[PDB]
Amino acid sequence: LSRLSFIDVVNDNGFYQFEKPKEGRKYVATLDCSDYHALQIIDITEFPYKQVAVYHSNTTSHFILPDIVFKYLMMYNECPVYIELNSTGVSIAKSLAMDLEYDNIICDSFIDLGMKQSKRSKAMGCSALKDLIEKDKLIINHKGTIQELRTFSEKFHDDLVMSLVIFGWLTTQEKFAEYAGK
């Protein structure tokens, strides 16, 4: 843990940015919705991964969120998004697809537009995260995230960590191959 430091970037209206988009780099975004909404944008290129932007808020209406997500996803090279399918993720993921006609959505199946909930995935995901940070394979820069990585037990908020767990689960998958690499 505690070898973790953060860059104290200003909270630009919910959106935290540590690196702006650089052509040639391939990003990936995971979302845990409405507790705050937490949008993690990671750089999966060089197997040094980097958390370049974070969207954090417990005050945006899930009604308008897709617009917010859309903005940042487009901003980072038509970025792929992996939405956890809780009661709200389902609606958000649909808007993102129908309403905003965004096509770079990662799906679990044609019916589930993101990560389908399961005790199995969360667990499996946590583990995958634990070995991404500890091996210094995932570089975190956000203050909140780091604070939650200090009040989140193996078994108070955790949205920013959950968000990074969606990312874990996404790394235990095969499809992750393509999206990866510059």
Contacts 24+ apart (CB under 8 A), 71-75: 72/15, 72/29, 72/39, 72/41, 73/29, 73/102, 73/104, 74/102, 75/21
Whole-number Å distance between alpha carbons of 132 and 100: 33
Which residues ranging from 60 to 89 are in contact with Mg ion (CB under 5 A)?
A: none
Among 5, 7, 11, 35, binds Mg ion (CB under 5 A): 35
- The nearer residue to Mg ion, 43 or 159, going by C-beta atoms, is 159
82 is in an annotated binding site: no
Among 43, 84, 148, 159, binds Mg ion (CB under 5 A): 159
Whole-number Å distance between alpha carbons of 60 and 77: 24
- The nearer residue to Mg ion, 35 or 134, going by C-beta atoms, is 35
Q: Which stretch binds Mg ion (CB under 5 A): 8-16, 33-41, 70-78, 144-152?
A: 33-41
Using DSSP's 3-state secondary structure scheme, residue 17 falls into strand
- The nearer residue to Mg ion, 112 or 158, going by C-beta atoms, is 158
**Which tokens go with 136?**
């210094």
Contact between 12 and Mg ion per CB under 5 A = no
Using DSSP's 3-state secondary structure scheme, residue 6 falls into coil
- The nearer residue to Mg ion, 33 or 52, going by C-beta atoms, is 33
84 is in an annotated binding site: yes
Nearest Cα neighbor of 85 from 7, 162, 150 is: 162
Which residues ranging from 36 to 65 are in contact with Mg ion (CB under 5 A)?
A: none
Contact residues toward Mg ion (CB under 5 A) are 32, 35, 159
Binding residues for Mg(2+), by number, are 32, 35-36, 84, 159
